[PDB]
Amino acid sequence: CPLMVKVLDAVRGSPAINVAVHVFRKAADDTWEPFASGKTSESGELHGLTTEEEFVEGIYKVEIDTKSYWKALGISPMHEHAEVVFTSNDSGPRRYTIAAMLSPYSYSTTAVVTN
Amino acid sequence: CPLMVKVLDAVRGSPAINVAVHVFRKAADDTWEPFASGKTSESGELHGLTTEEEFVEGIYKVEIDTKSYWKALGISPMHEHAEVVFTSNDSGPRRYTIAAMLSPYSYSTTAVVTN
Amino acid sequence: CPLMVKVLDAVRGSPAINVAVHVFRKAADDTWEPFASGKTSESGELHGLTTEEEFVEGIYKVEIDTKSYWKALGISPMHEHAEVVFTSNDSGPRRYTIAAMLSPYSYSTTAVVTN
Amino acid sequence: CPLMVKVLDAVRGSPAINVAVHVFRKAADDTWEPFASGKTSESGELHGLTTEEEFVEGIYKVEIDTKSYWKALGISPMHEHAEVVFTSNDSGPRRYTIAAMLSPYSYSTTAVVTN
Incomplete structure (x- = not known):
């Protein structure tokens, strides 16, 4: 939920299905601690990664296995992966x-925060 | 120049070459009057559309024929075109x-205004 | 539904709420006919614009009143609107x-087509 | 050059000036070796990171310090940085x-390979 x-x-205009996603959280000693992971569903969405209790303030890294996705579609991409690093600096029910929108030579990413 | x-x-990681561009200017009757046109060069750039003298204040529409571009590459796109509508003001920059960043199912258009 | x-x-990282959206369909005489319209909910989403019975093959324009959104936030934007024009074909997904992701000087738009 | x-x-419609950029190259033991760095000029461009002789085939990571850019404008952005990982090949475009297109809650990064 959180x-x-x-x-x-972006090439086929579809949800990217069965894409592996790893989430890490930055530890007190500046190392990346593994936090949660999963695969996108048929809608391209990955739900249930975490809970409100566990998703505290911090710096999080989302690494997307775009290369395996493209290769399973018959595409050899230029980008090796997609990575998005963000901060939650707002505790509470946020x-x-x-x-992430994907292409073999490009990605775009947007963060939407709601209450 | 202006x-x-x-x-x-963004799919092939290249300038979009030979893309047709049409510029329109809003007339007093709220119709779009043809203003200028051209096609992108081998660098993806289109220079010399207009002059300082001809480019007066008004509402301008820039339409980029992305559909013909994707079709010539054998790629089935979503959009008929990519566009920006903006107002030129003589108090603003010059x-x-x-x-425009293109992919078959995603695009962005930005007005970059410099002096 | 279709x-x-x-x-x-993209500036605030939030859904754009109460944004007016008008959809037009290109008539046989190359004119834009009003087809449907609505305003985005608190999730930024606009549901129920049309039905399968009404949504036939054709060329559609989705015109988003970004200008009123920005002015309600106290911003006079450079883009006058956002417009996404596409063709629906019946041999494909429905x-x-x-x-659309918005800033006063830019937008990006993504299409997801499912069956 | 290479x-x-x-x-x-993309929020202000301007080149992003004085943005720090760090480039790393993957070493034979899978570690990221610092390769080059610099900052964008008044045109938003960063030239002279490397030479043809030093930019040999390999896996390169480009990290763009978007956080400091936004913070210098008084904005606490979502992302810590923007990054791309790609492979250079000699028998290809050189x-x-x-x-990179930037906004506080959204960005895109594209690799453009030309000859």
Whole structure:
């Protein structure tokens, strides 16, 4: 509920299905601690990564296995992965949607925060 | 000189070459009057659309024929075109560059206004 | 149901609420005919614009009143609107989700087409 | 010459000036070795990161310090940075340009490979 990840395919105009997503949280010693992970569903959305209790303030990294996605579609991409690093600096009942739009040579990402 | 267009292909990671661009200016009867046109060069850029003298205050529409571009590459796109509508004001800055990033199911257009 | 529109604010990272959206369909005489309209909800989403019975093949213009959105936030924007023009064909998938991400000088738009 | 970075501020419609850029190259032991760095000029462009002789085939990471840019404008952005990882090949086009479009809650990064 507090964190959702959505992956779109800009070449085919479809949800990017079964894309692996890893989320890390920056630890007190500046290292990346593994936090949660999953695969996008048929809608391109990855729900249920975390809970309100666990998703505290911090710096989070979302790494998307775009290369495996493209290769499964018959595409050899130029980007090796997609990575989005963001901060939650607002505790409380805040909901984050991290959306990534993918192409073999490009990505775009948007964060929408709602209450 | 006062109005430039730059177009990139975010799927192939290249300038979008030979893309037709049409510029319109809103007439007193709220219809779009043809103003200028051209096609992008091998660098994805279109220079010389207009002159300082001809480029007066008004509401301008820039339409980039992305559909013909994608079709010539064998790619089925979503959009008929990519566009920006903006107002030229003589109190504001003096050079307008329309920067367009293209993919078959996603585009961005930005007005970059410089002095 | 066949057509959904979502509008996001790239400056604030929030849904764009109460944004007016007009959809037009190109008539056989090359004119733009009013087809449907609505305003985005608190989620930035506009549901129920049309029905399967009404949404036939054709060329559609989705015109988003970004100017009123920005002025309600105290901003006089450079883009006068956002416009997304596309063709629906019946041999392909039938549900279109059109998302637009806004700034006073830029927008990006994504199309997701499902069956 | 072989590697350039260009950054636009899509909220203000202007080149993103004085933006720090760090480039790393993957070493034989899978570690990221610092390769080059610089900052964008008044045109938003960063030239002279490297030379043809030093930019050999390999996997390169380009990290753009978007956080400091927004913070210098008084804005606490969502993202810590914008990054792309790509592979250079000698038997291919020999100029790589990373084009980045920025907003506080949204960005795109594209690799443009030209000859």
